[PDB]
Design a protein around this ligand. Structure first.
Ligand SMILES: *[C@@H]1O[C@H](CO)[C@@H](O[C@@H]2O[C@H](CO)[C@@H](O[C@@H]3O[C@H](CO)[C@@H](O)[C@H](O)[C@@H]3O)[C@H](O)[C@H]2NC(C)=O)[C@H](O)[C@H]1NC(C)=O
Ligand SMILES: *[C@@H]1O[C@H](CO)[C@@H](O[C@@H]2O[C@H](CO)[C@@H](O[C@@H]3O[C@H](CO)[C@@H](O)[C@H](O)[C@@H]3O)[C@H](O)[C@H]2NC(C)=O)[C@H](O)[C@H]1NC(C)=O
Ligand SMILES: *[C@@H]1O[C@H](CO)[C@@H](O[C@@H]2O[C@H](CO)[C@@H](O[C@@H]3O[C@H](CO)[C@@H](O)[C@H](O)[C@@H]3O)[C@H](O)[C@H]2NC(C)=O)[C@H](O)[C@H]1NC(C)=O
Ligand code: NAG
Ligand code: NAG
Ligand code: NAG
Ligand code: NAG
Ligand code: NAG
Ligand code: NAG
Ligand code: NAG
Ligand code: NAG
Ligand code: NAG
Ligand code: NAG
Ligand code: NAG
Ligand code: NAG
Lengths: 328, 175, 328, 175, 328, 175
C-alpha cells in the first residue's frame, strides 16, 4: 500500500501482568497454599468486648435473673413492667427472697424471654376466708418482711382455711400468662399452722388444661433461714377461656397476669459491658461487625450476624497468581 | 492455571507495573517502555468484585434460638441440643471451606484467562506482521515507532499499512 | 495439482452463534443478573389447592380429631377400624363427649398417626364387683347418655368398689396399644358417690414398666355441663408380655387393644379439599408437582416432594449468553 | 466467558439463526448465505441436558417427620423443634443458591468453549489458505464457490487443492 | 549458517496422551457415566466385624447393662469401679436382681456412659431407727438373699420407722452423683409390714433442687417371684452444696456417690467381638478404616470416623478421560 | 472437555504409551519413535494428587452423640431424634455427591488443558518451520533427524537454524 521503504527494522512487543513483592497465601481446590496478589478475610474473629446499645433494646439485668425480675424479688423491683429486645443476664446475679424452685425453669425463662415484656396487670381476685399478703423474713422488702411482688401468699384466717374456688375469664383478645405456685412446708406442724388441712392441694385449670400439684413436706437445706420451698408454675389463658384456681391449702396465688406478645426478643448470658454505639450483631463477647460472611467469635448470637464457623481464617483471593521477579 | 499464560508461557509478572493488572512493554526505534492495559484490567477487576459482593451478600438474622451452653447435667434433651448445634456448625464450616476453595480456584483461572485473551487479541490484530516468540512477546517485522506501538495498544493498528514491509523481511531468504 | 486459473478472488467465512430477542436473566458466580438465551425454573411455587386422593390413602377426618376418632367420641364412630396413609385433620374439627385431657397428647397423636390403623380388638376383661358401661349426658350417643366407644367407665356397686386386679397377656406376635384413663371428680362427694374410697388409684403395668396415677379432685371450668375430667394414658404391651391393671377407684378401663403397625403413615392439618387426581407430593396447601428439585409452597410435606427452600425463583440457564444484534 | 469467543471476539449473536445454536455465514463470488452447524449445536445441547437431568434426578420422599407449626407455647422442646427445621431450611436454601450459581457459570463457559472449538476446528481445516480477520471471520484467499463453502462446513475441505492459488495471492507483494 | 543439503525432506511429530484398556466409569456435572483412566473410591463400605481394642479403652459389658453395673446387680459385681472410653452393651445382657424401673432411664444411661467411670465412694450415712442392709431372694448374691451393692434397702426397727432426715455435704471440689430409689409395695399389708406408715414418702434435695416421690401400691406382673418394684432416681450434688434425704418410708438409700467426670466416653450397643488390633473408628458392625472421607457401614460411630453417607460407592476420577484407539 | 484436545482434535489415546501420561510420537530421516513427556505428566499428576489429598484431609472425630436406634415407641422426642439424624445424613450425602461431580468435571478439564498446553508449547517452539495438520501432528518442513526431534522434546530447538530450509520448501510454489 505504501511505497518501498529505505529503512528496515523490527520492534518487540511483550505482554505481561503485574506482581507484588508482598502477596498472600490462599487455599485452592488443587493446592492449599498458593500465593496470590491480594486476598480478603471472610472470618470475623474479634469483638470490641462491648455490647452496643443500638439498634436493639438491650436491658441489662444487673444483679437480677429474668425469672426473679418476673416474680418480683424485692431487689429486682426496678424491672417492673420493663421491656427488651435482648435481656442480658449477668453471672453475678443473685436471688434474695423466699427459696423457690421452678420445675422446667428453662421453658419459663424461654417463653418470658421471648415475649419480651414484663407488663403486669393486677386483677381483682377475691380470696374469702384466708389471710392475704403473707410475707417472710427471707424476702425483706425494705425494712419489712415481705414476699415476691407478683405473688400473694395465702394463709388461714383465724382458725381455718376454706376450699378456695375462684375464676377469672379472659375476656380480652390476647393471651394472659399467669404465674402461681405452691408452698412445700418443712414440717407437718408448719403445714397445719398455716393451712390447717394436713395435706393441701392446688388445681389450676382452664377449658383446655389442668394442673394439680400436691405439696411435699420435709426438711430441705437451710437457705436464708428457711427449709421450706415454694415451686413456681405457669398457665397461659387464651382469649375467651377461663382460669379457675381451686385449693384447700398451700396456694401461692397470682395477683393478675403478665401479658404475652410475639416479637424478636431473647435473653443472653454475658458479662460484657453495654456501651453506646451501634452494632447489629451481638455475641456474649460483645458486638462484632457483620461485614464478613462468617465469624469465629462465638456460636451464640443475636441479630444480623455472620455464620459461626470452626475456622478462624478463610481468605478469598481477590487477585491473580503472584509470580514475582527476584522476590522483594 | 487452565490457560497457561500466567505462570506459564509468560515466565513471570512485573513488580514494576503499578498502573494496571495486565499491560504491554515495548522496545522500538524511539526507545523502550511499558503501559498498562486498562480494558483487561477492568474485566478482571469487575469479575472479582462481582464474586466478592455475592459472597458478602445478605446476612441472615436470627433472634431467639436454642441454648448453647449448659451448667447442669441433664441427659437426653441436652444431648440433643448439643448435637443439633454441633452438626449445624460442622455443616456450615464445610460450606465455608469448600466455597473459598472453589472461588479461589476460579479466580486464578479467570485471571489466567484474561491474560491469555489479551494475548490472543493482540495476536489477531498484528495479522501477518508479527511472530510469536513464545514467551508472551511478539516480534513485529516492520518499523513500528511509538505511535505505531500505541495503535496496537489502543486497538487501531491497520495491518495492511505494513503488510508488504512486514512480509518481505519476514520471508527474507538468505542466512 | 490443478492448473493456473484466469479468475482470482477471495471468499469470507464468518462463524457465529444465535441470539434471541426475549432472553432471561440468571445468577452466576461472578454476576447476579446475566442474560442468557433460555433458562428453566427450579422452584415450584404453586399448588392446585387440592389434596389429590392418589396414590396415597388420604383419610379426611371431617370434624374429628385423630385422638377423638381413636377414643370413640360418638360423632366420630365412622372412623372405627379405619386406616390411612395420611390422616387430614380439619380446623373445624370439634369434640363432643366427656371432657378429657391427654398428658403428652402430642406423642399419642404421633404414634397413632404413625401406625396408620385404628383397628380395635375387644378383649374379655372381667371387672368383678363394679358397674360397667357407665356413660354421661355430655357424650350422648344417639338419644342416650353414653361414653367413648373404646373406654369402659366403671363405678361402684352398692357401697363397694373392690380392688380391681386384672391381667391380660400378649400372646400374639404383635404389639398391642392399650388406651385407658382415670376420672378426676369435681368434689369429694362425687368421689365417694362413684368410687366409695375417698382416694382412688390406677396402676397399669407390664413386666417392663408401670404407671400409677392418683386422681385429682377439684372444680375445673364447666365444659358440656361438667367440671370433672378424665385424663388419657396409653400402654404398649409387647408380644409375650402381660398387662396388669390394678385399681381401687377412678379407673376408666380399656375394652381391648388397638393393634400397632409400622408403615409410611402420618397426619397433616389442612383445610384443603380432597379431589380425585394423582399426585405424589402433598402439602397443607394441596398437592404440588414434583418435577422441580426445590419448592417454596410449604415446609410441611408428605410423599415424594421437592426440597423446601426459602427462595421463590431459581433459574437454571439452559442456553448460552444472549448478545443480540440490536438490544434487549 | 473463559474463552472469549461469545460476547468476545465474536461481537454479537445472530437473531436470524433459527436453525441451530452455532453456524456459518459467507460471501463468495456466487453470493452470500448462512447455515447452522449441527455438531456443535448438539454438543452444546447434550451437555446442558446432561446437567439438567442430573439436577432433576431423584426426589427423596419423606413420610412422618416432626411437627412444624405449633398453636400453644411450650418452651424448651418446641424451641428445639423450630431450630432443627430452621437450620435445615437455611442449609438447603444455601445449597440451591450455590448450585444454580456454579451451574450457570459453567453453562456460560461451556457454550463459550463450543463456539471457540468450532472456530479452531475451522481454522485448522483451512490451513494456509485463509487468514483470521479477528472478528470470527476467515478471509479465504482463493475462489471458493458454494460447494467449496459447503466442504468447509461438512469437514471435507482439501486445503492442498487450493494451496498454490491461496498462497500466491496471499503473499501478493505489491501495494 | 550451514551449507546447502542435497536432500529435501520433512518430518512428522504427533502429540498425544495415554489410554488404558481397563478404565473406570465416573459421574460428572454433565454426564453420570464417563470413562476415565483411573479413579479412587471415597466410600468405605466394609468392616472387619471386630471392634479393635486400641486406641480407645473398650469395656465389654458381657451380660451386664451399664445401669445394672452401676446399681450393682450381683452378677455385674465385676464392673465395680471400672472405667471406659466406650462401654459395649451386648444384646444378651440380662438383669437378675430386684425388679426396678428407671423413670428416664435413657438420660441416666447417657450421663453415666458419658462420664465414663463407675468409681464409687462409700459415705458414712447414719440411719437411726431403721434396719439396714435389707436384701431379697430375687437378688441372690452368692448363696444368700441380697440386693444391689450400691443401694441400701431400709425397713423399720422393731415397731417404728422414724422420719429419716439425714444430710451429707459436698465439701470436695467435684460433683457427686447419688443414686437412690423408692420401693413400691404390692399390697398395703406389705407396706405396713416393712415401713409401718401406710403411705411412705421420699424427698431428696439440695440447695438448688428437690424431688419428692410417693410410692405406689399395687400388684404388677410377677418377675423373679415379686410383684413389687423399686424405681431409681439420681441427684447430682455440686461442690459446696448439701444433700438432704428425708423420708418416713419406702426409701432405698444411697451408700455414697459415684464421682462424675468430663471426657470422651460413650456407650454403644454391639454384638461385635472385641479383638486386639488398632483402629480409631468404631461402628456397631466392628471397626472400619478411616482413610476414605465417607462411609456407608453404619450411622452410629465412635472415634475418628468417615462421614456416614447414603451412597455406597463414590469414585473420584484421578486420571484423564480414557479414549482407547482399538479398545482392548 | 473444555479445551477440545483430549477426545477432540486428538482422535484417541495411546494404550501403547506406558511411560507417561502425555507424549510425542515421530517419524524422521532416522526412523520412527515415541517418547513420554515428563513435565506435563507431572503437572497433571501433581494437581490431581493435590485435590486428592485435600479431599482425604482431616476426619472430624465425634464421641458421645445422640442415640440412633430405638426399641420402644415413644412419640415426640424420639421423632425429633430420628429427624435430626435423617436431615444430617441427607445433607452430607448431597455434599459427597456434588463434591465428586464438581471434582470429576474439573479433573477431566484439567487434563484436557495439560494436553492442549503441551500442544501449544510445541507449536510455539517450531515457529515458522512446521504446520499443524489439525490432528495433533505437526508437519516439520525441514530435515529433522533424531537429535533434532529430541531438541523439540527437551525444549532446546532453535528455529533459526532451520528457518530458511523450512520456509523454502514450505512455500514451494509448483504443483
Ligand atoms: C433435717 O436435717 C437438716 C440437715 O441435717 C437440718 O438442717 C439444719 O438445721 C439447722 C437448725 O436450724 C440449721 O442451723 C442454722 O445454720 C445457720 C448457718 O450455719 C446458723 O447461723 C443458724 O444459727 C443455725 O445454726 C442448719 O443450717 C441446717 N443445715 C442444713 C444443711 O440444712 C434440719 O434442721 C433437719 N430438720 C429437722 C426438722 O430435723
Ligand atoms: C367453682 O368455681 C367455678 C367458677 O367460678 C364454678 O363454675 C360455674 O358453675 C356454674 C354452676 O353450675 C356454671 O353455671 C352454668 O353455666 C352454664 C353455661 O353458662 C349454663 O348452661 C347453666 O345454666 C349454669 O349457668 C358456670 O358455667 C360455671 N362456670 C365456669 C366458668 O366454670 C363452679 O360451679 C364452682 N364450684 C363449686 C363447687 O363451688
Ligand atoms: C393380681 O393379678 C396378677 C395377675 O392376675 C396376679 O399375678 C399372678 O400371681 C400368681 C400367684 O403368685 C403367680 O403365680 C406364680 O407363677 C410362677 C410362674 O408360673 C410360679 O413359679 C409361682 O410359684 C406362682 O405359681 C403368677 O405368676 C402371677 N402372674 C402374673 C402375670 O403376674 C397377682 O397374684 C394378683 N395379686 C393379688 C394380690 O390379687
Ligand atoms: C485486595 O482486595 C480487597 C477486596 O477486593 C480490596 O478492598 C483491596 O483494595 C485489595 N488490595 C489491593 C492492594 O488492591
Ligand atoms: C404496669 O403497667 C400497667 C398497665 O398500664 C399499669 O396499670 C401498672 O400500674 C404498671 N405498674 C407499674 C409498677 O409500672
Ligand atoms: C468468646 O467468649 C467465649 C466464652 O464465652 C470464649 O471461649 C471465646 O474464646 C471468645 N472468643 C473471642 C474471639 O473473644
Ligand atoms: C490510537 O493511537 C494512535 C497513535 O497515537 C492515535 O493517533 C489514535 O487516535 C488512537 N486512537 C484511539 C481510539 O485511541
Ligand atoms: C429452554 O430450556 C428448557 C430446558 O432445557 C427446554 O424445555 C426449553 O425447550 C428451552 N427453550 C427453548 C426455546 O429452547
Ligand atoms: C374391627 O375389626 C376387628 C378385627 O376383625 C373386628 O373383630 C371388629 O368387630 C371390627 N369392628 C368394627 C366396628 O368394624
Ligand atoms: C401455603 O400455606 C401457608 C399456610 O399454611 C401460607 O402461609 C403459604 O403462603 C401458602 N403458600 C402457597 C404458595 O400457597
Ligand atoms: C460435503 O460437501 C461437498 C460439496 O457440496 C459434497 O460433494 C460432499 O459430498 C459433502 N460431504 C459430506 C460428507 O457431507
Ligand atoms: C489410581 O489413583 C489412585 C489415587 O491417585 C492411585 O493410588 C493409583 O496408583 C492410581 N492407579 C494407577 C494405575 O495409576
Ligand atoms: C473403689 O474406689 C474407691 C476409691 O479409692 C475405693 O475406696 C473403694 O474401696 C473401691 N472399691 C472397689 C470394690 O474397688
Ligand atoms: C452394619 O450393621 C447394621 C445393623 O446394625 C446393618 O443393617 C448394616 O447393613 C451393616 N452394614 C455393613 C457394611 O456391615
Ligand atoms: C536436548 O537434546 C539435544 C539433542 O539430543 C541434546 O544435545 C541437548 O543437550 C539436550 N538438552 C537438554 C537440556 O536436554
Amino acid at each position: 500500500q505504501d511505497l518501498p521503504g529505505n529503512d528496515n527494522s523490527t520492534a518487540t512487543l511483550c505482554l505481561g501482568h503485574h506482581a507484588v513483592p508482598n502477596g498472600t497465601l490462599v487455599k485452592t481446590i488443587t493446592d492449599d497454599q498458593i500465593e496470590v496478589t491480594n486476598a480478603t478475610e471472610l472470618v470475623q474473629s474479634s469483638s470490641t468486648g462491648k455490647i452496643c446499645n443500638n439498634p436493639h433494646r438491650i436491658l441489662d439485668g444487673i444483679d437480677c435473673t429474668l425469672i426473679d425480675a418476673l416474680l418480683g424479688d424485692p431487689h429486682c423491683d426496678v424491672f417492673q413492667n420493663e421491656t427488651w429486645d435482648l435481656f442480658v443476664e449477668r453471672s453475678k446475679a443473685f436471688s434474695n427472697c423466699y427459696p423457690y424452685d421452678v420445675p422446667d425453669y428453662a421453658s419459663l425463662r424461654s417463653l418470658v424471654a421471648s415475649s419480651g415484656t414484663l407488663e403486669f396487670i393486677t386483677e381483682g381476685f377475691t380470696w374469702t376466708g384466708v389471710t392475704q399478703n403473707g410475707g417472710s423474713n427471707a424476702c425483706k422488702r425494705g425494712p419489712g418482711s415481705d414476699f415476691f411482688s407478683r405473688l400473694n401468699w395465702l394463709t388461714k384466717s383465724g382458725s381455718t382455711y376454706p376450699v378456695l374456688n375462684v375464676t377469672m375469664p379472659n375476656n380480652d383478645n390476647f393471651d394472659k400468662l399467669y404465674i402461681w405456685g405452691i408452698h412445700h412446708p418443712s414440717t407437718n406442724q408448719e403445714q397445719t399452722s398455716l393451712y390447717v388441712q394436713a395435706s393441701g392441694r392446688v388445681t389450676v385449670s382452664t377449658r383446655r388444661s389442668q394442673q394439680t400439684i400436691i405439696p411435699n413436706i420435709g426438711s430441705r437445706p437451710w437457705v436464708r433461714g428457711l427449709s421450706s420451698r415454694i415451686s413456681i408454675y405457669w398457665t397461659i389463658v387464651k382469649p375467651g377461656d377461663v382460669l379457675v384456681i381451686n385449693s384447700n391449702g398451700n396456694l401461692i396465688a397470682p395477683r393478675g397476669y403478665f401479658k404475652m406478645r410475639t416479637g424478636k426478643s431473647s435473653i443472653m448470658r454475658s458479662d460484657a459491658p453495654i456501651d453506646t454505639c451501634i452494632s447489629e450483631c451481638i455475641t456474649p463477647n460483645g458486638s462484632i461487625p457483620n461485614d464478613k460472611p462468617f465469624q469465629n467469635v462465638n456460636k451464640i448470637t443475636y441479630g444480623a450476624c455472620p455464620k459461626y464457623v470452626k475456622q478462624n481464617t478463610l481468605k478469598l483471593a481477590t487477585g491473580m497468581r503472584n509470580v514475582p521477579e527476584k522476590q522483594t | 492455571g487452565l490457560f497457561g499464560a500466567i505462570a506459564g508461557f509468560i515466565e513471570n509478572g512485573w513488580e514494576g507495573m503499578i498502573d494496571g493488572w495486565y499491560g504491554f512493554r515495548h522496545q522500538n526505534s524511539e526507545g523502550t517502555g511499558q503501559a498498562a492495559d486498562l480494558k483487561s484490567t477492568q474485566a478482571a477487576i469487575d469479575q472479582i468484585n462481582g464474586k466478592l459482593n455475592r459472597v458478602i451478600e445478605k446476612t441472615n438474622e436470627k433472634f431467639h434460638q436454642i441454648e448453647k451452653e449448659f451448667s447442669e447435667v441433664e441427659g437426653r434433651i441436652q444431648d440433643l441440643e448439643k448435637y443439633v448445634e454441633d452438626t449445624k456448625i460442622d455443616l456450615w464450616s464445610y460450606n465455608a471451606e469448600l466455597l473459598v476453595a472453589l472461588e479461589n480456584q476460579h479466580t486464578i483461572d479467570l485471571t489466567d484467562s484474561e491474560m491469555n485473551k489479551l494475548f490472543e487479541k493482540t495476536r489477531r490484530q498484528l495479522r501477518e506482521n508479527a511472530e510469536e516468540m513464545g514467551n508472551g512477546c511478539f516480534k513485529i517485522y516492520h518499523k513500528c515507532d511509538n505511535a505505531c506501538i500505541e495503535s496496537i495498544r489502543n486497538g487501531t493498528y491497520d495491518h495492511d499499512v505494513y503488510r508488504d514491509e512486514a512480509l518481505n523481511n519476514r520471508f527474507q531468504i538468505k542466512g
